[PDB]
Design a protein around this motif. Structure first.
Motif, PDB file in Angstrom:
ATOM      1  N   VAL A 117     -12.661  81.474   3.265  1.00  0.00           N
ATOM      2  CA  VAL A 117     -13.751  80.667   2.745  1.00  0.00           C
ATOM      3  C   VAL A 117     -13.885  79.377   3.532  1.00  0.00           C
ATOM      4  CG1 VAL A 117     -14.767  79.592   0.706  1.00  0.00           C
ATOM      5  CG2 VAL A 117     -13.417  81.683   0.462  1.00  0.00           C
TER       6      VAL A 117
ATOM      7  N   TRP B 178     -13.696  84.206  -7.122  1.00  0.00           N
ATOM      8  CA  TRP B 178     -12.669  83.944  -6.105  1.00  0.00           C
ATOM      9  C   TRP B 178     -11.906  82.640  -6.327  1.00  0.00           C
ATOM     10  CZ3 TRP B 178     -12.354  87.739  -2.220  1.00  0.00           C
ATOM     11  CH2 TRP B 178     -13.442  88.619  -2.155  1.00  0.00           C
TER      12      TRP B 178
ATOM     13  N   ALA C 152      -9.331  82.578   0.137  1.00  0.00           N
ATOM     14  CA  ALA C 152      -9.747  82.944  -1.214  1.00  0.00           C
ATOM     15  C   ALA C 152      -9.269  84.329  -1.620  1.00  0.00           C
ATOM     16  CB  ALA C 152     -11.256  82.845  -1.347  1.00  0.00           C
TER      17      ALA C 152
ATOM     18  N   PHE D 192     -18.376  82.923   3.189  1.00  0.00           N
ATOM     19  CA  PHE D 192     -17.296  83.879   2.986  1.00  0.00           C
ATOM     20  C   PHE D 192     -17.169  84.773   4.203  1.00  0.00           C
ATOM     21  CE2 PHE D 192     -16.192  83.230  -1.506  1.00  0.00           C
ATOM     22  CZ  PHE D 192     -17.195  82.346  -1.847  1.00  0.00           C
TER      23      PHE D 192
ATOM     24  N   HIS E 213     -22.715  83.774   1.430  1.00  0.00           N
ATOM     25  CA  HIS E 213     -22.555  82.350   1.191  1.00  0.00           C
ATOM     26  C   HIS E 213     -23.011  81.977  -0.213  1.00  0.00           C
ATOM     27  CE1 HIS E 213     -26.903  81.196   1.497  1.00  0.00           C
ATOM     28  NE2 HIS E 213     -26.932  82.403   2.035  1.00  0.00           N
TER      29      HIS E 213
ATOM     30  N   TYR F 278     -20.800  77.466   0.835  1.00  0.00           N
ATOM     31  CA  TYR F 278     -19.551  78.197   0.990  1.00  0.00           C
ATOM     32  C   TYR F 278     -19.800  79.485   1.756  1.00  0.00           C
ATOM     33  CZ  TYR F 278     -17.215  75.131  -2.383  1.00  0.00           C
ATOM     34  OH  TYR F 278     -16.662  74.049  -3.028  1.00  0.00           O
TER      35      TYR F 278
END
Ligand SMILES: NC(=O)c1ncc(N[C@H]2CCCNC2)c2nc(-c3ccc(Cl)cc3)cn12
Length: 256
Positions: free
Chosen positions: A33, A6, A22, A67, A59, A65
């Motif tokens: 994100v 991504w 993303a 998502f 994540h 992160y």
């Protein structure tokens, strides 16, 4: 930039870190994100599966992160014209969707604790999605309810019992915040900085001075619902099943 497959385009916002857009430059799939409770937020997010709740894709650590389902419509906050609100039919529809999302969460024993227009996003179809579960928590497990004892949320949106009680039920708090959102949607302003005895605006409301803003900008029908939601005593406050039976809630509305 990019995380694995991504690539991160723009900074869509930020809590609190930063929410980025993303794009799977290959499959072209678009997702939100969020760049960084955190542990609990992920755990809670993993339980979420509803059309009115932002979906959690996964994540990655690497700074975690998260998502999430991309809501191109942005925040409900920006659909609220200051001092005006929005057309009643739009407000009613968003409220219907908000209730659906809250019913779902409460049904799985989850309380959001931070319902406000900044945490309610809209997809490309303008469908409302509850977002930002950083303050959410479990209030029911194994069919046993647990009272809340911590104070979390955003002042203008918190229920009064949260400021005055040692322990309180989670559900009525989320319901209260939904009423504050409804108020904002119909009046384009918040009724008070906080629901305390030291707040003139709150006292005026308890004294039923609806000839004052923002109540005077609100039609009698939705206003009657607000009278049932914004009730000081949480045990007397209207429940969602009863909200769904409300006259305005069931009123057919046309724009335009
Ligand atoms: N999951 C998403 O999609 C998403 N999650 C969180 C966002 N921001 C946070 C910021 C802190 C308060 N809560 C909301 C956000 N903003 C947009 C957006 C979409 C379109 C535009 Cl034009 C602008 C912002 C999309 N999101």
């Amino acid at each position: 930039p990019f995380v694995e497959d991504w690539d991160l385009v723009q900074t869509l916002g930020e809590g609190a870190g930063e929410v980025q857009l993303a794009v799977n430059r290959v499959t072209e799939e678009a997702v939100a994100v969020k760049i960084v409770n955190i542990k609990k937020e992920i755990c809670i997010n993993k339980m979420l599966n509803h059309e009115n709740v932002v979906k959690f894709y996964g994540h990655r650590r690497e700074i975690q992160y998260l998502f999430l389902e991309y809501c191109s419509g942005g925040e409900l906050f920006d659909r609220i014209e200051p001092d005006i609100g929005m057309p009643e039919p739009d407000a009613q529809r968003f409220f219907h969707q908000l209730m659906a999302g809250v019913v779902y969460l409460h049904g799985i024993g989850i309380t959001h604790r931070d319902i406000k227009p900044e945490n309610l996003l809209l997809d490309e179809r303008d469908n409302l999605k509850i977002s930002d579960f950083g303050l959410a928590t479990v209030f029911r497990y194994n069919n046993r309810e647990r009272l809340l004892n911590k104070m979390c949320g955003t002042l203008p949106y918190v229920a009064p019992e949260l400021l005055k009680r040692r322990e309180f039920h989670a559900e009525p708090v989320d319901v209260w915040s939904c009423g504050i959102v409804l108020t904002a949607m119909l009046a384009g302003e918040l009724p008070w900085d906080q629901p305390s005895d030291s707040c003139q605006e709150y006292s005026d409301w308890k004294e039923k001075k609806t000839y004052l803003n923002p109540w005077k900008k609100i039609d009698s029908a939705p206003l009657a619902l607000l009278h049932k939601i914004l009730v000081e005593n949480p045990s007397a406050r209207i429940t969602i099943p009863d909200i769904k039976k409300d006259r305005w809630y069931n009123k057919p509305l046309k724009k335009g």
